[PDB]
Design a protein around this ligand. Structure first.
Ligand SMILES: [Co+2]
Ligand SMILES: [Co+2]
Ligand SMILES: [Co+2]
Ligand SMILES: [Co+2]
Lengths: 322, 327
């Protein structure tokens, strides 16, 4: 009962899934208005097809595109790349930290209708329904960012669809988001505190993992080992971020881990050549988790059925509507 | 002599009575397609727009310049559909207003110049519809990004001959900073309209810009929140100045010899989502005439005050014709 861009699929059809990915990290209407920024729309489709086929050959069967309205989600692009690559792509709703005036002047009740429109009816005029809700917070929650967290909760409770968040982990936003989700009546088993790998703090993660929250260790290839790339991605290495997966397995929270790359095939919501800077830091792309992180954990003393539990059974339990 | 409309190129003589600053929808990038239910439905918005433009046409309007940019949620397909059904020429816009998303605000002046050029020379999105005007904006002192938008607009105008029109916080005298930046790029004042100029009563500011060759946009004549001072949202947007006060600025500029520098419009819309929810209903109640307000209520008002019919015809037909013509 998991909604994808090609239609509804079952829990067994999901397989190896990456919980936090992006085909394109852009802005609302941007891809349609300026496709030449990515070379052409043809070039972005071709680069995304080759990148997903690389992930499929590596073991991945499903990717969850957490690109929201304001990240410039184009479900028609998501459907085209999914068809040519034979990889299941799950679409998303919600609002990130770049909402336009028509979204930021809306009440909590109006934002619930929009989220409920994209999950129950469909996205735009395509009929494609959203299977996950993406929300954001950069530091302490602004008066509007609180309404998005609450609206995402009211939409998750009426459909059963899960929530995934953006967090500035060094500032520990996951505790405030958790306090807001719990005040709304949302079950912690339906929420994923993303970007939790941006910190080396383990005491903040185990506290949330004990309450039932899923920990999103999603930006593993993000290593700044360029003032723009050093501020966006990486103070530490990938080995340090991948050791945080092992540190949570050792504490007995193997059922709460969700791994991903947080990769893109086109990036426009930052500096011009950030995609070219990223493409060489990680030449593996979206295939970094099964080819470089899984054999690392196998060498550092973690069995294959613990890793096959994190990648197959954990995201399938998360993405299933309850 | 030839200008781009959403139905294709037309000869300037066919433009006729032209409203220089209007919107079919005041929204945000991708909003109409992602949430048409905000406006009832996409079909309801089209029907309302067609009815409004048909009524405006019956009153004498032949062309409107939709100054909706990418970030005002310009949907050219909607503009084309309504233009064809109402049989009113609609000139589309490029440029950037004051709500650009991350992918726009992180761009350099060279990249923004290429985006504006693409929308004028090649087309908007995958439609083939080309922009006939560049819309820019400042709300007080220009931010570093707004300065880049103004420079890119000036560069695209110099390369194509297409005019530039602006949004200003008129009380803050924004037109002076805008003018300075445009002229630093070598753009002729005759290719620029300093809009929302009816938001101020400072005639010294207006005549000085007009004296330099700038077109003065007295473009929101029906905007008045008198009678509804209890509505904090409507008062902050529409202001407390009467439609008459805004319209008398057209007479004031004519009297000082600047009839050739005046552009008049309503700054109306059929859908409004970039503000509070009830705003379109409130606006439609204050002004039931919509875009027809200029020929039905403003033109006869100025005739009562003594302005000749040939001067008014010069402001509504000749001035927009000279402005829109690629020069
Ligand atoms: Co993020
Ligand atoms: Co992301
Ligand atoms: Co304006
Ligand atoms: Co306007």
């Amino acid at each position: 009962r998991i909604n994808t861009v090609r239609g509804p699929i079952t829990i067994s059809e999901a397989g190896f899934t990456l919980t936090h990915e992006h085909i394109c990290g852009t802005s609302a209407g941007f891809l349609r208005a300026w496709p030449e920024f990515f070379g052409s729309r043809k070039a972005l489709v071709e680069k995304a097809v080759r990148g997903l086929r690389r992930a499929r050959a590596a073991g991945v069967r499903t990717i969850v595109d957490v690109s929201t309205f304001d990240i410039g989600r184009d479900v028609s692009l998501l459907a085209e790349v999914s068809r040519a690559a034979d990889v299941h792509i799950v679409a998303a709703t919600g609002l990130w930290f770049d909402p336009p005036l028509s979204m930021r002047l809306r009440s909590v009740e109006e934002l619930t209708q929009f989220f409920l429109r994209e999950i129950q009816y469909g996205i735009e005029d395509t009929g494609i329904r959203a299977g996950i809700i993406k929300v954001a917070t950069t530091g302490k929650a602004t008066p509007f960012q609180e309404l998005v967290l609450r609206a995402a909760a009211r939409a998750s409770l009426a459909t059963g669809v899960p929530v995934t968040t953006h967090t500035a982990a060094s500032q520990r936003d996951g505790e405030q988001q958790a306090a807001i989700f719990e005040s709304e009546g949302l079950s912690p088993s339906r929420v994923c505190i993303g970007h939790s790998d941006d910190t080396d703090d383990l005491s903040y993660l185990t506290a949330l993992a004990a309450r039932g929250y899923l920990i999103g260790l999603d930006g593993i290839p993000w290593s700044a080992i360029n003032a723009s790339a050093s501020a966006l991605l990486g103070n530490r290495s990938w080995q340090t971020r991948a050791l945080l997966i092992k540190a949570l397995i050792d504490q007995g929270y193997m059922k709460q881990i969700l791994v991903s790359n947080d990769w893109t095939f086109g990036f426009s919501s930052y500096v011009t050549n950030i995609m070219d800077v990223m493409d060489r830091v990680n030449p593996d792309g979206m295939a970094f988790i099964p080819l470089r992180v899984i054999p690392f954990l196998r060498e550092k003393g973690v069995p294959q059925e613990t890793l096959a539990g994190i990648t197959v059974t954990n995201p399938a339990r998360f993405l299933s509507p309850t």
